[PDB]
Amino acid sequence: MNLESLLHWIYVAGMTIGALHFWSLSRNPRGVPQYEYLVAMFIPIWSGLAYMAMAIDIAHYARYIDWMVTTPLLLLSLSWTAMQFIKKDWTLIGFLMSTQIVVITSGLIADLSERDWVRYLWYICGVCAFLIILWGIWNPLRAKTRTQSSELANLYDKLVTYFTVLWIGYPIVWIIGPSGFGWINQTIDTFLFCLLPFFSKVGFSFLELHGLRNLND
């Protein structure tokens, strides 16, 4: 077992404990609907299985297949929270989910590219889609909370802030590592791509679910 494998196995253990936690919470719901629990549970399982694949073995192909599914589901969870006590705006949800899939596919195309100028344009394409996500979660998604209580609005702000900080991390780590400028080697890059998603997948959903449970009482 090499270092990358070990980091991946640790991440797999992390996902496993978070999903069990979310499962445990789902059994004593405290006013939180089951669909929120189930998505919160599915995210780390999907990511867990993708990382397990890498642990058993372009580099880290499975990382993209993880993101293909987990990142729109994370936006779904964020969107459910913003609209917790109102009608769910499904086309807004759909907008955010699909735009986020463009970010990931752009990243993958970028990483599959042999010419540097092409690689970076696809990266920029990914960043642009990501900027639309950030505009989306800070403006129209955020305005949905204004018709609801300030407890919910405050919870959202905390969640969207935590969400934003972590998500900005991905394009940065991508571009400083072997896929981009090569300022860091693959093993350190893998390490950051374990630490960052643990907080995005377990950390975020943990704050989401506990926030919603305390808000209900």
Instruction: State the binding string over 123-142 for ligand RET (x if CB under 6 A, else -).
Output: x--xx--x------------
- CA distances to 12, 48, 63 from 54, rounded to whole Å, are 10, 10, 8
Q: Does 106 bind a second copy (CB under 8 A)?
A: yes
Q: Does 91 bind a second copy (CB under 8 A)?
A: yes
Scan residues 167-206 and list those touching a second copy (CB under 8 A): none
Q: Does 59 bind a second copy (CB under 8 A)?
A: no
| Strands in 45-135 per DSSP E | none
- Rounded CA separation 42/44 (Å): 6
Q: Does 101 bind a second copy (CB under 8 A)?
A: yes
Rounded to the nearest 10°, the torsion over CA 72, 77, 79, 85 is 160
Scan residues 81-120 and list those touching ligand RET (CB under 6 A): 103-104, 106-107, 110
3 state SS of 114: coil
The entry of ligand RET, a second copy, none that residue 167 binds, CB within 5 to 8 Å by partner kind: ligand RET
CA 51 to chain centre: 15
Q: Which of 44, 136, 197, 211 binds ligand RET (CB under 6 A)?
A: 197
Q: Which two tokens stand for residue 26?
A: 């789902």
For a second copy, the closer of residues 94 and 182 by Cβ is: 94
- Rounded CA separation 104/112 (Å): 12
Scan residues 156-175 and list those touching ligand RET (CB under 6 A): 167, 170-171, 174
Site residues (vs ligand RET, CB under 6 A): 67, 70-71, 74, 103-104, 106-107, 110, 123, 126-127, 130, 167, 170-171, 174, 197, 200-201
